[PDB]
Design an enzyme around this catalytic site. Structure first.
Site, mmCIF file in Angstrom:
data_model
loop_
_atom_site.group_PDB
_atom_site.id
_atom_site.type_symbol
_atom_site.label_atom_id
_atom_site.label_comp_id
_atom_site.label_asym_id
_atom_site.label_seq_id
_atom_site.Cartn_x
_atom_site.Cartn_y
_atom_site.Cartn_z
ATOM 1 N N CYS A 215 0.884 -1.160 0.000
ATOM 2 C CA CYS A 215 0.000 0.000 0.000
ATOM 3 C C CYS A 215 0.924 1.213 0.000
ATOM 4 C CB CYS A 215 -0.986 -0.082 1.165
ATOM 5 S SG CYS A 215 -0.285 -0.512 2.821
ATOM 6 N N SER A 216 0.685 2.260 0.799
ATOM 7 C CA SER A 216 1.686 3.330 0.831
ATOM 8 C C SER A 216 2.861 2.998 1.773
ATOM 9 C CB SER A 216 1.031 4.664 1.196
ATOM 10 O OG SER A 216 1.967 5.732 0.958
ATOM 11 N N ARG A 221 -3.376 -1.416 5.204
ATOM 12 C CA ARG A 221 -4.143 -2.239 4.262
ATOM 13 C C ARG A 221 -3.407 -3.538 3.932
ATOM 14 N NH1 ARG A 221 -5.579 2.779 0.114
ATOM 15 N NH2 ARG A 221 -6.168 4.239 1.798
ATOM 16 N N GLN A 262 -2.937 -0.549 11.363
ATOM 17 C CA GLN A 262 -2.522 0.788 11.809
ATOM 18 C C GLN A 262 -3.534 1.499 12.699
ATOM 19 O OE1 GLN A 262 -1.585 2.242 7.652
ATOM 20 N NE2 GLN A 262 0.058 3.312 8.722
#
Ligand code: JFS
Length: 284
Positions: A215-216, A221, A262
């Protein structure tokens, strides 16, 4: 406790934040000394997300072998995953070098290139058949072969060529395009459908190297994806599926990469996904 009724008990008591903070307190702490060397500053997207030394993926290079990527090896479930950050302008060649060297079949992307008006990762694959990409620092060529755009996700076929040996391989790109800019999805149905499409492709199976998922930052995710997959596999393998403890599985995965899941909302969403998924696997 079982999962579905532990779930309703946390909802009624409104204690998701306390459950999640317990996980954060109990999680492993291992060194990440290579990630913090000064020569690697422009190889990390976020200063507080780093791979542990003991589980990091090494590039097959003698100059600098560092990439922000971790091997998550789940022994009882017999599944492995590589979790990594979204590639940076100066790490797109390293990313595809890793895919090549680790013999991965599939790449799973859970973000959009731009979210919340800011760039969350580089445009690291080609968008038109006739406009291929060459990564000169790692001597690889990448071509778009086909693209299938659906309402919640897109699947792409890519050709990766090692220009040094002229060997070629087919890579599948699974791109979940509809995770909301804020929060988590209201229903897990489309995320589960996506997981099943990745499974059906062979990309998660032992005849290939580990799937690469990002993901980032490669922890939120991305953590939801591998946590849901592993919990569902354990429910199929065990005599007593109600023995699968999602908090214990998450703490095992956090031995291999920091920070997985997170927010308390991502934790609740992971429970929801496993609960609904377990009904579809059989018949309710
Ligand atoms: O592999 C998917 C899969 C397998 C088994 C089950 N399952 C069957 N009975 C259960 C009781 C409690 C929890 C899960 C249960 C679910 C999902």
């Amino acid at each position: 406790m079982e999962m579905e009724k532990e779930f309703e008990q946390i909802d009624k008591s409104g204690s998701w934040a306390a459950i999640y903070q317990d996980i954060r307190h109990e999680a492993s702490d291992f060194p990440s000394r290579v990630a913090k060397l000064p020569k690697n500053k422009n190889r990390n997207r976020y200063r507080d997300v780093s791979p542990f030394d003991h589980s990091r993926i090494k590039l097959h290079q003698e100059d600098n072998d560092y990439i922000n990527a971790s091997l998550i090896k789940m022994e009882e479930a017999q599944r492995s995953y590589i979790l990594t950050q979204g590639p940076l302008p100066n790490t797109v060649g390293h990313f595809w070098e890793m895919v090549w060297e680790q013999k991965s079949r599939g790449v799973v992307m859970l973000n959009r290139v731009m979210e919340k008006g800011s760039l969350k990762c580089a445009q690291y694959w080609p968008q038109k058949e006739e406009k291929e990409m060459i990564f000169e620092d790692t001597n690889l060529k990448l071509t778009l072969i086909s693209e299938d755009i659906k309402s919640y996700y897109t699947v792409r076929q890519l050709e990766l060529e090692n220009l040094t040996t002229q060997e070629t391989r087919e890579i599948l790109h699974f791109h979940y395009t509809t995770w909301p800019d804020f929060g988590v999805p209201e229903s897990p149905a489309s995320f589960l459908n996506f997981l099943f499409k990745v499974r059906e492709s062979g990309s998660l199976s032992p005849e290939h190297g580990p799937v690469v998922v990002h993901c980032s930052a490669g922890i939120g995710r991305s953590g939801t994806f591998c946590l849901a997959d592993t919990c569902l596999l354990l429910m199929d393998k065990r005599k007593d599926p109600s023995s699968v403890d999602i908090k214990k599985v998450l703490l095992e995965m956090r031995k291999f990469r920091m920070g997985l899941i997170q927010t308390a909302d991502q934790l609740r969403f992971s429970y929801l996904a496993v609960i609904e998924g377990a009904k579809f696997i059989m018949g309710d």
